[PDB]
Amino acid sequence: STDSIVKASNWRLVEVGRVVLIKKGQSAGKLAAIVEIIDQKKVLIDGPKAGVPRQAINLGQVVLTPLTFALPRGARTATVSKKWAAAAVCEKWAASSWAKKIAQRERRAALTDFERFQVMVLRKQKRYTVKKALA
């Protein structure tokens, strides 16, 4: 008969191979990848390319990321760094709006006052054309 409309969610789910991003830690902000699972609350990870050591960490301190790649259960630092370069994970990550807005915030914070004045100047020119055009 007619198709059955159904949808609950498509979560980003912890698994052997998922990328994560740390929000609170000694190396927060830097990417990482999951190796395997300990229990419901904590896992072990290693981001070798970003300089993350091989840790065991809970899941409150991290944020699961949509992008994912493949690796076997119980992997090691070298294998992880290998597949990390294989899957173009860093470039898949820098291409999304999340990393764009992170770098946006971090460049807005790094503005000298001359640049904060430049932006006040520049925004007056674009909105002038936009008000000339929406009229």
Binding site: S1, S4, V6, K7, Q40
Partner: protein, 189 residues
């Protein structure tokens, strides 16, 4: 403990299409259709085929999984009630006083009253649910036959009947009078 993934699987025959969103279910079929609300339970759904849904609950902890199979048997019975339907065959019991049962249209919709319950003069009536049909037998005329699609409505109506005509201040071990159910079945099987 807390589990990980406890999932049941609901089959679906042909002629049934289940529109499910925000746990507000709609289930159609030849007999008719039936809605349902499950906002008060935390459970997922995945339409892996047009022939079965996979219902699942995560960790939960022995009080969510207890409701998982409950949900599954609600949906299974609703699909059953829109594919085939339900009937309840009730009977009467007495020795001396009959139980004159009738359907009367009062100021609103149908009511189903009984007279002469142990010689009472309270002409007691009952409201009929909106999704229910009703009839009598012909092999014998000391019965009644409820029918419909929602079992929780039909059986609740039958229970409403047999709860109001209960004997009181008398030994029920002796005065085995009233009405009762005798068969739950379908109107296509």
């Amino acid at each position: 403990m807390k589990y990980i993934q406890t999932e049941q699987q609901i089959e679906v025959p042909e002629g049934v299409t289940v529109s499910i969103k925000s746990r507000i279910v709609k289930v159609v079929g030849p007999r008719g259709t039936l809605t349902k609300n499950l906002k008060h339970i935390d459970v997922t759904f995945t339409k892996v085929n047009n022939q079965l849904i996979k219902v699942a609950v995560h960790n939960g902890g022995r009080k969510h999984v207890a409701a998982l199979r409950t949900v599954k048997s609600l949906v299974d019975n609703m699909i059953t009630g829109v594919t085939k339907g339900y009937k309840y065959k009730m009977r009467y019991v007495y020795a001396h006083f009959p139980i004159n049962v009738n359907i009367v249209e009062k100021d609103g919709a149908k009511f189903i009253e009984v007279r002469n319950f142990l010689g009472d003069k309270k002409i007691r009536n009952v409201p009929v649910r909106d999704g229910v049909t009703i009839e009598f037998s012909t092999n014998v005329k000391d019965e009644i036959v409820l029918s419909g699609n929602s079992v929780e409505d039909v059986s609740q109506n039958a229970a409403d009947l047999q709860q109001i005509c209960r004997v009181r201040n008398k030994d029920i071990r002796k005065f085995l009078d009233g009405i009762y159910v005798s068969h739950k079945g379908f109107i296509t099987e």
